[PDB]
Design a protein around this ligand. Structure first.
Ligand SMILES: CNc1nc2cc(C(=O)O)ccc2c2cnccc12
Length: 330
């Protein structure tokens, strides 16, 4: 059976709390009236939701209503709990209200509005300093919620709302976030395919905060190489191959051994033998202004199979990649 694993930071944060902090299934939710908000326009469809710009009648402030698509009621309580738990954390989205349409009686979350620029036009225009700044701001959100016993489990560009005029950022969609408890085996069918850590692709269920750190590497590599996405796999099985073609197969296989992981028989063929590439293969004419010996070193220290050797959010923020943004924040 698979060797166990314990997160190497914030391992026991949750054990040390009142039970009601993390025992969300008993959380008693007070549902408001959704007529307090009039929907203006659809901002986007989701897999588990539909999101609308809306107006708060009382004050006239722009708001966002995320009507939740029908899932196990405790998953809603999980998301609500995690949001009331993180309220006011650096760069976390703010849950303004919880309501239910009086006619449909179908639950919805009301969040603060963010004048966001979507990454489809944004990531194509950021200077090297901008990539350092916003990445640092993501790390603020990740280290906070990790320190608070929560993994986000779905870090990807659509979930990072960026406001470029006021240089603000907020990390959103907490509907897949879980509380971390040492020894818990988690579901591996979480996150989006391009940002799935190798632990999810091989079905290693005792994962932790560090999964969020692989997703951040995928983003970092996607931005500094102007490749969206960086690991462009055809499914979950081929996704591991796209990773392996870059990180090498020796290493992956020691990772399988180090945890006595049972590989699917499917993987036993399509993976092959592959060397570990030097990141220089990916830098070309039109993306070298964004690459530096620093970014490469930071990036190398996120993309590791072994979830235990990834940087922590806290370690990431002390990387020299961020020395200037740390300075200009003084
Ligand atoms: C696709 N557009 C938006 N989706 C959101 C999703 C969540 C959530 O699921 O947590 C929270 C907030 C927003 C949001 C906020 N302001 C402007 C736009 C959006």
């Amino acid at each position: 059976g698979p060797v166990p694993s314990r997160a190497r930071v914030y391992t026991d944060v949750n054990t040390h709390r009142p039970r009601e902090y993390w025992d969300y299934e008993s959380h008693v939710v007070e549902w408001g009236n959704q007529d307090d908000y009039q929907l203006v326009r659809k901002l986007g469809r989701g897999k588990y939701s539909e999101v609308f710009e809306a107006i708060n009648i009382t004050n006239n402030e722009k708001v966002v209503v995320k009507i939740l698509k029908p899932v196990k009621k405790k998953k809603i309580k999980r998301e609500i709990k995690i949001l009331e738990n993180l309220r006011g954390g650096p760069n976390i989205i703010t849950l303004a209200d919880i309501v239910k349409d009086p006619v449909s009686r179908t639950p919805a979350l009301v969040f603060e509005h963010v004048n966001n620029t979507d990454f489809k036009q944004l990531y194509q225009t950021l200077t090297d300093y901008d990539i350092r700044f916003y990445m640092y701001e993501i790390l603020k959100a990740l280290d906070y919620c990790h320190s608070m016993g929560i993994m986000h489990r779905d870090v990807k560009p659509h979930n990072v709302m960026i406001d470029h005029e006021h240089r603000k950022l907020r990390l959103i969609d907490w509907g897949l976030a879980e509380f971390y408890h040492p020894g818990q085996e988690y579901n591996v069918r979480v996150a989006s395919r391009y940002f799935k850590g190798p632990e999810l692709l091989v079905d290693y269920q005792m994962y932790d905060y560090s999964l969020d750190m692989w997703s951040l590497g995928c983003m970092l590599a996607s931005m500094i190489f102007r490749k969206e996405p960086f690991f462009h796999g055809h499914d979950n099985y081929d996704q591991l191959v796209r990773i392996a073609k870059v990180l090498g197969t020796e290493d992956l296989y020691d990772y399988i051994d180090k945890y006595n992981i049972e590989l699917d028989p499917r993987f036993n063929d399509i993976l092959g033998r592959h060397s570990r590439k030097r990141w220089e293969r990916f830098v070309h004419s039109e993306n070298q202004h964004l690459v530096s010996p620093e970014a490469l070193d930071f990036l190398d220290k996120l993309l590791r199979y072994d979830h235990q050797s990834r940087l922590t959010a806290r370690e990431a923020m002390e990387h020299p990649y961020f020395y200037t943004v740390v300075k200009d924040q003084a």
